[PDB]
Amino acid sequence: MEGMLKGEGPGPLPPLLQQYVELRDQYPDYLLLFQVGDFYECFGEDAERLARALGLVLTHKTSKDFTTPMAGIPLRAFEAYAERLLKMGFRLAVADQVEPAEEAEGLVRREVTQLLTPGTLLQESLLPREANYLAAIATGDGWGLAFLDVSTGEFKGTVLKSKSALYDELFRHRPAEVLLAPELLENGAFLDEFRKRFPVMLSEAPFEPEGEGPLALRRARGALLAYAQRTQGGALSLQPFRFYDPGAFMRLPEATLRALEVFEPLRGQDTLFSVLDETRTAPGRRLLQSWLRHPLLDRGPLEARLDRVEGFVREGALREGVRRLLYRLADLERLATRLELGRASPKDLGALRRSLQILPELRALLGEEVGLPDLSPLKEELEAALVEDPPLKVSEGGLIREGYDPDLDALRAAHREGVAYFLELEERERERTGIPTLKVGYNAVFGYYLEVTRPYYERVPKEYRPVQTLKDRQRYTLPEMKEKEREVYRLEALIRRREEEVFLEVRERAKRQAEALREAARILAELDVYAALAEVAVRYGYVRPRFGDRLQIRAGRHPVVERRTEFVPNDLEMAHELVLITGPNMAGKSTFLRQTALIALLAQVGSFVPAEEAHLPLFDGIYTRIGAGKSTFMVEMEEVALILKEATENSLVLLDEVGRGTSSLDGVAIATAVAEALHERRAYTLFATHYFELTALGLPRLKNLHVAAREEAGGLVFYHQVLPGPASKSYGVEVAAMAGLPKEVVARARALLQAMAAR
Amino acid sequence: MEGMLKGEGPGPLPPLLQQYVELRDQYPDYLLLFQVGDFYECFGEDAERLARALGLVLTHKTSKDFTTPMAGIPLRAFEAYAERLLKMGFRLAVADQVEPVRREVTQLLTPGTLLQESLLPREANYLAAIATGDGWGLAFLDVSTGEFKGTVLKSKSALYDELFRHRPAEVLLAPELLENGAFLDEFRKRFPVMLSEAPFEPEGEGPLALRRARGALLAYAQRTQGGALSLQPFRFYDPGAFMRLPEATLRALEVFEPLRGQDTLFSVLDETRTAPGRRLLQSWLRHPLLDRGPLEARLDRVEGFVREGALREGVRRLLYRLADLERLATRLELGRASPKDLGALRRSLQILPELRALLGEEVGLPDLSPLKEELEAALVEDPPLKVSEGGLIREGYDPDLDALRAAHREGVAYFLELEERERERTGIPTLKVGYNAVFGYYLEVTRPYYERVPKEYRPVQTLKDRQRYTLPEMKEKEREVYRLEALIRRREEEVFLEVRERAKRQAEALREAARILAELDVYAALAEVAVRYGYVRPRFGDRLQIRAGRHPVVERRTEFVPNDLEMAHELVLITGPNMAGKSTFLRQTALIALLAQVGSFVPAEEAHLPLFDGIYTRIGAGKSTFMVEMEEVALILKEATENSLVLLDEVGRGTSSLDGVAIATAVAEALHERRAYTLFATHYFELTALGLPRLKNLHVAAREEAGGLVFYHQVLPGPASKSYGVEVAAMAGLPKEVVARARALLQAM
DNA sequence: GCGACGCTAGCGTGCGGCTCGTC
DNA sequence: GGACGAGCCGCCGCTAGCGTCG
Ligand SMILES: Nc1ncnc2c1ncn2[C@@H]1O[C@H](COP(=O)(O)OP(=O)(O)O)[C@@H](O)[C@H]1O
Ligand SMILES: Nc1ncnc2c1ncn2[C@@H]1O[C@H](COP(=O)(O)OP(=O)(O)O)[C@@H](O)[C@H]1O
Ligand SMILES: [Mg+2]
Ligand SMILES: [Mg+2]
């Protein structure tokens, strides 16, 4: 069994290392960072792991019995080192010195304070402005999926019917760590797939049901709570759990977010989110992100969002003011959570004090209608307790302002006089001794001292007690000092105790406003998004969309592509119609399709869009078969299947070249059947194809569009006007030629084309 | 800004920072790493970068009149941060404190001029330079090996190819190229690699563009290896004297790098035991042979080891981990060999005698026993390049050093007697005798014994729990131990240098040895591979006949189905359902031809192959895919000859079905008239019936087992007659109605 | 016939703070 | 001869090695 360390030598394991091993084997998959004084240490193989991983120095901690390896890092840089460690895939186990040193039974009590897992981080410097989720998956009456953001207390979940739905929901939440129920873990089949589709870190957790609701949900939830409660090291700060239904929002499968690069790019470029987000606060960015993850289906609320955006679009003054003020607004939502968790540092409070000072200016600028909570009381006491620049930890320098604590002002009082003492003494001795240069100094090793140079050694009085000798200086001590020096240490010792109590007192003060802090967070976050979305409209020429059943876009453009090129706007009118798009490659087909979806996606999120006039219907979902079964034809077909099994007459469907990847024959066949299917379905379907046949089909709601090329001076020039009607001819041979194909080879091709044309 | 440091305050740069800025300003395009004690430091704006790029602790360097930000890395950790910093596109200038307030630029770390082993791969590491004149000038240099070669290319297309065969680490474009905005905009896009500036004043003879490129390399590399370079005679070569292997083919075939999803022809194939070997073999794969004479000679050598298993196994054992004599030689020649190097060298020399026993005089290895006896006589059984430079020469090697070390030791003894003797008079069995730079030697007494501390003493320094004293009869014996510790350094370094020099006088013998072993290593390894995976010796002749050939890389991962092929300047179409094996087949055919013309055995039973002049592929995936594919095709049509192996994989796709078949037919014809060995996997059954005299059909098929379709991987003769598109959409999950509708449509046509 | 305490010099990650030599 | 390198001690805690309770 386990209970031994890697150290060479016989005899027993020292009292400390003993305590080290005792905790180290309770968290087998965590790198244990042992708190020994002002350093975090690791011994044995664990010490080696560290040294190399962090380039630290490898040393040893020798004892009578044996000698083991040692590696440590100064607490000062804990987080600094933590971050690096986490990014490599380690779970950290922080074992701290619980009870103080001065009052310990020899060996100071040490226990694991917190656990640092990628999906349960609370450390602000270790978190992105974005939401950080822990996700739990379980079975038992369908698929159970739950998320928890330990830093904000967001706690939500649902139950999905298919393995497909689960993966979609999971992929739109971008979980940073996943807990898999017993069943799924065992099943090597599933695990492979999951591990392959979501390269996220996996972790073990007990899936004992918790609360009420579908068995599956209760298990995932419990798993979350079980795990998080363990890494936090105490009760968690949870928000009302949301058992939500993804059927209430617009469907955005994984293939759509990916193909549309809503959150992640295909080529280290921009994404819809990067381009759209100009929020100033972190909760703001989170809100916006949340909105994109689940676009609304309901006209009313979307119109509500659009009014508030339009508001700031008009009030440029106001809009720039609110944004000018939010630049300084801290993550209240997270701060409120750190407080409730009794983790708030003086850094946090200083931050809180600044944010709260912005409130009243926002109140004035927008009016008392914003609903902002009145924290003026809290804000003030903070300004009256904290230094203009709050230090990191309490025991060190001044944290509380002078004049705030009667008990503490008397302490700095006594300390000031006490220090002055030694100053007075200097002059008294420089006289009695007649030694002009006589200094009075201090230092950790010997305490307060009287210093005298060599030229005056024979001039030093009997009374002086030697304490330290240097190259050409000697240091003495009088009895008076010895006393007054301990009066100073007592003070200093009392000054810390109190300064920290006052801090803790004031903190708890802010902790009773946590909920108020939370609601200001929400209000100010919406404020942030509304102004940001407006900022984006103004800067990039977007307009307010109008909803209805007919889609009529005028001068629409791709929101991301136009960011890096003179983009030629285009129009579109659809209505449960089947719109085929033909024309030469490099002309614009694929970009046109993508442009259409993004516009729809932006509108149904409440943002203005990249067009001159945009009348949009409320799509129940955006489905795509763009870009991307051993074969390609099979992979593309599997997608058409999915798209075909969920599209409704209220779905925006975008097909790009469906039918490619096989025989010309099965090509047209499949494409035709498919195009007929989506036609019957009655969804809004944009199909970019190379089978001119599909354009001639005998369908009642079939419309035709095309892009074109003009064979000019230097070959072929592709314009991007998406003109009405079908494409006339294909430009393959022409392109081949342009590509450099030997002139005879091309001419032979033209002859073959014209021969087959002759029937 | 020269003399300017990013900081706050008026007053001049203190003495130190003044020095720093003086060097910093000498190597502008580089990040200057300044030595300060046990760290490499950066100041001002540079410190901010270093801190940024490595995420370090920004702090400040303060003097009365100026404070500037600083950040640094431990002198030790150096080579580890250098790597991160290099990979990030950083060029490094190292400034070391000349072994005892004085600093200078020792090295210049650069992607394509690296000399430090821990920063180099087993493979060659080139610095390339491209210039212009009548045709392109390409020249490669590998400062760690001395390899110096070049050629003159006619087409920018051929340029890129040679540039890619070599995978340079750093490129130097002449000024005409750097100013040509279109080229540079293209070069970066197609060749993501660090581009450096460098003078191009011609050097030597031959074409103007070559001499110029050659000069850039020489001039630039010397700046790096601060002085004369160690280089073997410049080798001018002709890409036309070897089998052509263009970037398209190298990538398509994954000779050196995978399309992601590991395993290259090279990894599978590579089984060498030394770096020179790995380099040799890579060199061969890089330029396959045309001439049967040499090829048959290589195959002869390979067979030698396939027969002599005892020999093969005995040689691969001895070579295990054997050092890189070629690089070692170069470091010695450059005057950069570390004591650790000399130690590695002696180990290598010790093994050399054994290899000669096994092989024999035939081989021609040099007898270096004398150098090996020397190295065994002077070096400790573990030289330490890092540990000072002391504890380097062993006892009894050099009398002078020996006498000094002995005297020193006595001193230490004295300061061990003063200890035993004193506490044996003061009753303080605690009393210590330690030393410190500040005052030299001393006596150390703990707090308790101050009452038992005599007056013959003289305190010099007091500590928390103890105080250190002095004595009269102790100064001399200090000013002596030191005068020696110094001399021991002075002398030991002399001997080390003397010894290092003897090793350096055997540079050629080392290079000659390295080279021979490299061949032996390669032949013996190509033998090992043939014996393990069952490769056969190929035969050369105007007809291609392969009996049961397998894709060499693919098979190491699954049960492979071998196949046959009989070509002869014919157009061989391959139809059949996707997922059956068309693309793999073309590729195995190509890899086999490659292994053969490299002098390796091949993955088959019988392989009679023609000596192709080049293998041109068109396989796999602002510009439409179609246009890119056509450009590749145009390349082949302008290159392929009747002795070329051309592999067309579904050419024609990416456009209309008409233009598709039309283009595809015109190409198939052009290659037919060309008379090259063409394997054309297509979906256009039209090609299958062109009826050309040298056209031929082959296809793969699929059965309808259990649920849907199972693809057998057998390449049968003649064309396929079906397409399983609809059959596949069915398995894909397409709604039965849509599937049925498709079938109705299919037939209806 | 030896378990149990007490006193206390000393080491050691990374790194302020203190000292000292040179001018 | 006030200021600038250049380098050693010790932090906070635990231990081992010594005396000693009796
Ligand atoms: N409306 C447009 N305005 C400006 N550039 C466009 C437009 N549509 C396409 N492009 C350009 O054409 C290139 C892409 O071809 P694309 O139109 O997507 O493919 P195709 O027409 O082959 O489906 C894009 O990278 C972009 O630079
Ligand atoms: N000779 C073979 N033996 C075993 N598997 C093979 C063989 N040739 C091909 N395959 C299989 O086919 C896959 C590749 O199909 P591929 O060669 O690309 O066929 P195609 O181009 O007709 O789609 C391989 O990864 C493997 O699964
Ligand atoms: Mg396209
Ligand atoms: Mg294929």
Is the minimum distance from the CB of A624 to ligand 1 under 6 angstroms? no
Give the residue ranges of DSSP H helices in B10-90. 15-24, 44-54, 78-87
Give the C-alpha separation, B460 to B251, whole Å. Answer: 73
CA distances from A142 to A209, A223, B370, B401 (A): 15, 17, 79, 82
Give the C-alpha separation, B497 to B510, whole Å. Answer: 19
Tokens found for residue A407: 């008990």
Q: Which backbone phi and psi does A347 adopt, to 5 degrees?
A: -60, -50
B432 neighbors B406 (Cβ within 8 angstroms) = no
Please enumerate in sequence order all residues whose Cβ is within 8 A of that of A152, keeping only pairs 6 or more positions apart, or say none.
Answer: A131, A239, A283, A286, A333, A334, A337
Q: How far is the CA of B689 from the centre of ligand 1 (A)?
A: 38
> Chain A partners of B630 at a C-beta cutoff of 8 Å?
735-736, 739-741
Which residues precede gaps in chain B, with C-N > 2.5 A? 100, 621
Tokens found for residue A13: 């394991």
CA dihedral sign, ordered B600, B602, B607, B612: negative
Please enumerate in sequence order all residues whose Cβ is within 8 A of that of B360, keeping only pairs 6 or more positions apart, or say none.
Answer: none
The residue whose CA is least distant from atom 17 of ligand 1 is A588
Is the minimum distance from the CB of A568 to ligand 1 under 6 angstroms? yes
Tokens found for residue A419: 């220090």
Is the minimum distance from the CB of A564 to ligand 1 under 6 angstroms? no
Q: What angle do CA B15, B16, B20 make, to 5 degrees?
A: 120
- What's the gap between Cα A529 and its chain centre? 17
Give the C-alpha separation, B612 to B540, whole Å. Answer: 10
Is the minimum distance from the CB of B724 to ligand 2 under 6 angstroms? no
Tokens found for residue B549: 């050939």
Q: How far is the CA of A398 from the centre of ligand 4 (A)?
A: 72
A6 belongs to an annotated ligand binding site: no
DSSP-derived 3-state class of residue A78:
helix
Tokens found for residue A272: 């819809």
A104 touches strand D (CB under 7 A): yes
Count Cβ atoms below 10 Å from residue A242 Cβ, excluding itself: 13
CA dihedral sign, ordered A102, A108, A113, A116: positive
CA dihedral sign, ordered A406, A408, A409, A415: positive
Give residues lining strand C (CB < 7 Å).
A 36-39, 41, 56-57, 59-61, 70-74, 76-77, 443, 468, 470-473; B 57, 59, 430, 432, 438-439, 444, 446-448, 461, 465-466
Give the C-alpha separation, B92 to A694, whole Å. Answer: 61
DSSP-derived 3-state class of residue B692:
coil
Give the C-alpha separation, B253 to A428, whole Å. Answer: 91
- The ligand with the least distance to the CA atom of B584 is 2
Q: Which of A195, A217, A219 lies closest to A206, judged by CA?
A: A219
DSSP A635-652: HHHHHHHHHHHH--TTEE
Nucleotide of closest approach to B463 (CA, C1'):
D9
Strands A723-724 vs A702-706: parallel, antiparallel or unpaired: antiparallel
Give the C-alpha separation, A255 to A521, whole Å. Answer: 33
A334 neighbors A124 (Cβ within 8 angstroms) = yes
Give the C-alpha separation, A653 to A577, whole Å. Answer: 11
> Chain B partners of A469 at a C-beta cutoff of 8 Å?
459-462, 467
Tokens found for residue A328: 């300084």
Q: Ligand 3 (ion): which residues have CB within 5 A?
A: A 590
> Chain B partners of A586 at a C-beta cutoff of 8 Å?
622-624, 627
B38 neighbors B74 (Cβ within 8 angstroms) = yes
Is the minimum distance from the CB of A587 to ligand 1 under 6 angstroms? yes
Strands B466-469 vs B461-462: parallel, antiparallel or unpaired: antiparallel
A381: left (phi over 0), alpha (psi -120 to 50) or beta: alpha
Q: What angle do CA A55, A61, A67 make, to 5 degrees?
A: 110
Domains in chain B and their CATH numbers?
2-119 (3.40.1170.10), 124-241 (3.30.420.110), 242-361+506-534 (1.10.1420.10), 368-503 (1.10.1420.10), 535-748 (3.40.50.300)
Report chain B's terminal Cα–Cα distance, integer Å: 77
B720 neighbors B577 (Cβ within 8 angstroms) = yes
Cβ–Cβ gap A637/B729 under 8 Å? yes
CA dihedral sign, ordered A740, A741, A744, A750: negative
Tokens found for residue B574: 């391959």
> Chain A partners of B734 at a C-beta cutoff of 8 Å?
637, 640-641, 644, 670
- What's the gap between Cα B596 and its chain centre? 25
Give the residue ranges of DSSP H helices in B544-656. 582-596, 625-639
CA distances from A387 to A353, A409, A564 (A): 11, 14, 47
Query: Could you say which DSSP state residue A369 is in?
Result: G
Is the minimum distance from the CB of A586 to ligand 1 under 6 angstroms? yes
Q: Which backbone phi and psi does A650 adopt, to 5 degrees?
A: -115, 20
- The ligand with the least distance to the CA atom of A631 is 2
SS (H, E, C) B615-645: EEEECCCCCCHHHHHHHHHHHHHHHCCCCEE
Distance from CA(B465) to C1'(C10), angstroms, rounded: 10
B369: left (phi over 0), alpha (psi -120 to 50) or beta: alpha
Query: Could you say which DSSP state residue B301 is in?
Result: H
Please enumerate in sequence order all residues whose Cβ is within 8 A of that of A403, keeping only pairs 6 or more positions apart, or say none.
Answer: A409
DSSP-derived 3-state class of residue A52:
helix
Q: Which of B321, B284, B333 lies closest to B146, judged by CA?
A: B333
Cβ–Cβ gap A741/B633 under 8 Å? yes
Partner residues linked to B417 by β-bridges: none
Of the CA atoms within 13 Å of residue A157, those in its CB half-sphere come to: 33
Give the C-alpha separation, A117 to A93, whole Å. Answer: 9
A395 touches strand D (CB under 7 A): no
Give the C-alpha separation, A248 to B200, whole Å. Answer: 68
Binding residues of B for ATP: 576-583
Burial (0-12, 13-18, 19+ Cβ within 10 Å), B182? exposed
Query: Could you say which DSSP state residue B447 is in?
Result: G
> Chain B partners of A641 at a C-beta cutoff of 8 Å?
732-735
Give the C-alpha separation, B496 to B340, whole Å. Answer: 11
Tokens found for residue A366: 């927008």
Relative orientation angle of helices A282-293 and A514-540, to the nearest 10 degrees: 70
What experiment produced this structure? X-ray
Give the C-alpha separation, B29 to A90, whole Å. Answer: 38
DSSP B235-285: EE--GGGS-B--HHHHHHTTSSS-SSSS--HHHHH---SSHHHHHHHHHHH
Give the C-alpha separation, A388 to B612, whole Å. Answer: 81
Query: Hey, which bits of A331-458 come out as E strands?
Result: 439-441, 449-453
Kindly give the number of the ligand 2 atom that is closest to the alpha carbon of B700.
22
Is the minimum distance from the CB of A287 to ligand 1 under 6 angstroms? no
> Which residues in B240-274 are b (16+ Cβ under 10 Å) and which e?
eebbbbbbbbbbbbbbbeeeeeeebbbebbbbbbb
Give the residue ranges of DSSP H helices in A112-266. 163-173, 182-186, 188-197, 215-232, 254-259
Give the C-alpha separation, A213 to B320, whole Å. Answer: 64
Partner residues linked to B445 by β-bridges: B467
Kindly give the number of the ligand 1 atom that is closest to the alpha carbon of A722.
1
Can you tell me which residue has the tokens 């020269």?
B2
Q: Which of B308, B299, B266, B317 lies closest to B122, judged by CA?
A: B266
Partner residues linked to B644 by β-bridges: B614
Q: Which of B646, B664, B668, B666 lies closest to B655, judged by CA?
A: B664
The residue whose CA is least distant from atom 16 of ligand 2 is B581
Can you tell me which residue has the tokens 């003044």?
B18
Count Cβ atoms below 10 Å from residue A589 Cβ, excluding itself: 25
Give the residue ranges of DSSP H helices in A664-741. 664-681, 692-696, 732-738
DSSP-derived 3-state class of residue B468:
strand
Give the C-alpha separation, A624 to A259, whole Å. Answer: 7
Count Cβ atoms below 10 Å from residue A281 Cβ, excluding itself: 26
A723 neighbors A581 (Cβ within 8 angstroms) = no
Partner residues linked to B69 by β-bridges: B60
What's the farthest any 2 CA atoms get from each other in chain B? 121
Give the C-alpha separation, B615 to B255, whole Å. Answer: 12
Cβ–Cβ gap B657/A690 under 8 Å? yes
Q: Which backbone phi and psi does B364 adopt, to 5 degrees?
A: 95, 15
Distance from CA(A676) to C1'(C20), angstroms, rounded: 92
Q: Which backbone phi and psi does A130 adopt, to 5 degrees?
A: -70, 165
Tokens found for residue B167: 């995978």
Q: Which of A551, A572, A577 lies closest to A701, judged by CA?
A: A577
CA dihedral sign, ordered A590, A593, A595, A601: negative
A625 neighbors A643 (Cβ within 8 angstroms) = yes
B17 touches strand D (CB under 7 A): yes
Give the C-alpha separation, B452 to B464, whole Å. Answer: 18
Give the C-alpha separation, A624 to A260, whole Å. Answer: 9
Q: Which backbone phi and psi does A118 adopt, to 5 degrees?
A: -50, -30
- Which of A591, A598, A687 for mutating ligand 1's site (highest number of atoms within 8 Å of CB)? A591
Query: Could you say which DSSP state residue A11 is in?
Result: S
Give the C-alpha separation, B627 to A585, whole Å. Answer: 9
Q: Which of A585, A634, A746 sits opposite B732 (nearest CB)?
A: A634
Query: Could you say which DSSP state residue B55 is in?
Result: T
Q: How far is the CA of B682 from the centre of ligand 4 (A)?
A: 9
DSSP H/E element including B315: helix B309-318
Q: How far is the CA of A594 from the centre of ligand 4 (A)?
A: 28
Is the minimum distance from the CB of B487 to ligand 2 under 6 angstroms? no
Nucleotide of closest approach to A56 (CA, C1'):
C13
Partner residues linked to A110 by β-bridges: A97
Give the C-alpha separation, A267 to A254, whole Å. Answer: 17
Can you tell me which residue has the tokens 């298919």?
A162
Q: How far is the CA of A540 from the centre of ligand 3 (A)?
A: 26
> Chain A partners of B656 at a C-beta cutoff of 8 Å?
690, 692, 730, 732
